[PDB]
Amino acid sequence: MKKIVLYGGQFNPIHTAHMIVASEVFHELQPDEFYFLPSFMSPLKKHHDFIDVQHRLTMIQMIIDELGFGDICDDEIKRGGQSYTYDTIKAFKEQHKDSELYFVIGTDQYNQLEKWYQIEYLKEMVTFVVVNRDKNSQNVENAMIAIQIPRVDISSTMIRQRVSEGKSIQVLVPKSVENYIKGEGLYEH
Amino acid sequence: MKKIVLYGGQFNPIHTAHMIVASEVFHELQPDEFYFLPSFMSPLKKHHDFIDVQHRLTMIQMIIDELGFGDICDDEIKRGGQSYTYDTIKAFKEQHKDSELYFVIGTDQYNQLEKWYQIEYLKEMVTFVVVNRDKNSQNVENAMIAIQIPRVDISSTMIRQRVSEGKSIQVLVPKSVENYIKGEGLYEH
Ligand SMILES: Nc1ncnc2c1ncn2[C@@H]1O[C@H](COP(=O)(O)OP(=O)(O)OC[C@H]2O[C@@H]([n+]3cccc(C(=O)O)c3)[C@H](O)[C@@H]2O)[C@@H](O)[C@H]1O
Ligand SMILES: Nc1ncnc2c1ncn2[C@@H]1O[C@H](COP(=O)(O)OP(=O)(O)OC[C@H]2O[C@@H]([n+]3cccc(C(=O)O)c3)[C@H](O)[C@@H]2O)[C@@H](O)[C@H]1O
Ligand SMILES: [Ca+2]
């Protein structure tokens, strides 16, 4: 009966398009809880210049402070290794029986979902919520939920690329995160 | 030799994509001055539900506060009527000779520049600076400047439409503008 939304990501760093996704899903679904779920290492991704965990969590808290909703689920950081969503959700669900689970992903992840670990079991445990990325609308099958957001082409890779070349990231992240990155020397080469 | 940028708009309301445009242009061209230039009534657009002029100026100043650069140029508000850019620039330039003038527009205005008043004369007085809108890349002729920005599909129409239907505009405008719209009851029906 309780509605719980989880939004998974490497969040390296979290940015203004992640904020728009979270805001739109939260206001459309009106869940009882909303969790940002930072991975330790997200599968299907290379983890190069691994800054460590405290920095990523701090910037996610700065987003929550500004949005005025949300919590961090640190299960994946505690577990370490490759962060397979099926392992996360199996454990989360038995700590929160009697609630409906919603897992938010963008278009890029939706299109490679057959490559996720234990995907047939995970699709029975959560309702996937898919937001449009690099296009203006997203179609899904009737078992899933599509949420249409204003299209915003910002990525974490773009942010790290800019910082390394000395280009501004003003607006692309909130002011708090911008000053944190500069202040801590994150992504500088 | 002094470099001056003007960024014209109806700004009804100013929003997060306008801030991205301004930030990208400012950091790329490093002008000596940067002016937000609000029109009274911009040509080639319908002006139904005309709010007080002071509301628009207040929201623009909140963007300036956040960005940390820029000033309002109120020339068109003082003049009233249809706000033809040729008239604006002819007057502005006779108060700022010895300066190079740059005028920022997005793709939609670029594509209809033949419909602008006295366009042949205006192209001699300013360098047009074009940012991509509704696409990822903008080509221009060699006399103009293209600045590539992260594509962000937010419009003022979107903002007004959301507000009227009771939909959230969180993140799509800054928090100060969001609370200002709500408290002044703007765009409510
Ligand atoms: N501009 C934008 N517009 C709309 N959506 C945007 C976006 N930028 C990122 N996104 C989305 O936000 C999210 C965060 O992106 P980013 O921080 O890169 O994170 P990402 O590496 O994309 O991982 C997203 C989640 O999927 C999980 N996953 C991925 C692959 C395999 C498996 C498995 O279990 O086998 C699990 C992963 O652990 C994590 O919880 C993603 O869903 C992404 O599509
Ligand atoms: N998401 C987005 N991404 C990239 N660019 C975006 C954008 N949203 C708006 N823009 C752009 O920002 C600007 C502000 O938009 P908005 O507030 O609607 O304003 P708008 O009505 O488009 O007017 C822009 C300027 O052009 C002038 N103009 C227009 C037509 C005819 C003539 C004439 O002299 O005959 C003069 C007008 O007076 C004003 O200074 C525009 O350049 C628009 O293209
Ligand atoms: Ca809590």
Range of the domain at A1: 1-189
Q: Is-contact B171 A171, C-beta < 8 A?
A: no
Ligand 1 environment, Cβ below 6 A = A 8-11, 17, 21, 37, 39, 42-45, 83-86, 105-106, 108-109, 116-117, 131, 133, 152, 154-156
Residue B116 CA to residue A83 CA, distance in Å, equals 56
A185–chain B Cβ distance below 8 A for any pair: no
Q: Is-contact B26 B5, C-beta < 8 A?
A: yes
> Chain A window 68-127: which residues touch B at a Cβ cutoff of 8 Å?
none
Residue A60 CA: distances (Å) to CA of A3, A66, A70, B42: 22, 10, 10, 40
Give me the torsion for CA of A154, B19, B155, B180, rounded to 10°.
120
* Protein residue whose Cα sits closest to atom 40 of ligand 1: A8
Residue A29 CA: distances (Å) to CA of A33, A95, A96, A145, B125: 10, 22, 19, 10, 52
Give the Cβ contact number of residue B104 at 10 Å: 26
Of B97, B110, B116, B98, whose CA–CA distance to B137 is shortest?
B110
Antiparallel, parallel or unpaired: β B71-72 and B33-38:
parallel
Type and span of the H or E element at B180: helix B175-184
Pick from B136, B150, B167: which is nearest to A154 by CB? Answer: B150
Residue A107 CA: distances (Å) to CA of A134, A183, B149: 8, 33, 21
Q: Which own/partner pairs from B47-55 qualify as long-range (CB within 8 Å, at least 24 positions apart)?
A: B47/B10, B49/B187, B51/B12, B51/B186, B53/B77, B55/B184, B55/B186
- Read off φ and ψ for residue B113, nearest 5 degrees: -65, -25
Residue A6 CA to residue A92 CA, distance in Å, equals 11
Q: Is-contact A150 B172, C-beta < 8 A?
A: yes
Give the Cβ contact number of residue B13 at 10 Å: 27
Instruction: Scan for tokens 């801590």, then name that residue.
Output: A184
Supply the DSSP symbol for A133: S
Of B91, B89, B97, B153, whose CA–CA distance to B118 is shortest?
B89
Residue B164 CA to residue B188 CA, distance in Å, equals 5
Token reading at A130: 């898919």
Of B179, B157, B158, whose CA–CA distance to B58 is shortest?
B179
Residue B23 CA to residue B19 CA, distance in Å, equals 6
Counting the structural domains of chain B, the total is: 1
Separation of CA B172 from chain center: 16
State the CATH number of the domain containing residue B75.
Answer: 3.40.50.620
Chain A residues within an 8 Å CB radius of B30: none
Residue A76 CA to residue A74 CA, distance in Å, equals 6
Type and span of the H or E element at B27: helix B16-29
Token reading at A89: 């959700």
In DSSP notation, A20-63 reads HHHHHHHHHH--SEEEEEE-SB-TTS---S---HHHHHHHHHHH
Buried b (16+ CB within 10 A) or exposed e, B43-57: eeeeeeeeeeeeebb
Residue B175 CA to residue B178 CA, distance in Å, equals 5
Considering Cα of A70, then A171, then B85, then B177, what sign does the dihedral take?
positive
Q: Cβ-count burial of B88 within 10 angstroms (0-12 exposed, 13-18 middle, 19+ buried)?
A: buried
Buried b (16+ CB within 10 A) or exposed e, A156-170: bebbbebbeeeeebb
Of B143, B121, B127, whose CA–CA distance to B25 is shortest?
B127
Q: Is-contact A151 A135, C-beta < 8 A?
A: yes
What is the SS3 assignment for B150-163? CCECCCHHHHHHHH
Q: Is-contact A186 A13, C-beta < 8 A?
A: yes
Residue A167 CA to residue A27 CA, distance in Å, equals 33
**What size, in residues, is chain A?**
189
Token reading at B184: 């002044």
Type and span of the H or E element at B35: strand B33-38
> ∠A16-A66-A165 over CA atoms, to 5°?
35
Chain B residues within an 8 Å CB radius of A165: none
B57–chain A Cβ distance below 8 A for any pair: no
Considering Cα of A158, then A164, then A165, then A171, what sign does the dihedral take?
positive
Token reading at A87: 């392992």
Q: Is-contact B69 B34, C-beta < 8 A?
A: yes
* Single-letter amino acid code for the residue at B121: Y
Q: Cβ-count burial of B65 within 10 angstroms (0-12 exposed, 13-18 middle, 19+ buried)?
A: exposed
End-to-end alpha carbon distance in chain A: 49
Q: Is-contact A154 A136, C-beta < 8 A?
A: no
Q: Is-contact B127 B102, C-beta < 8 A?
A: yes
Buried b (16+ CB within 10 A) or exposed e, A97-119: eebebbbbbbeebbeeeeebeee
Instruction: Scan for tokens 């006779």, then name that residue.
Output: B94
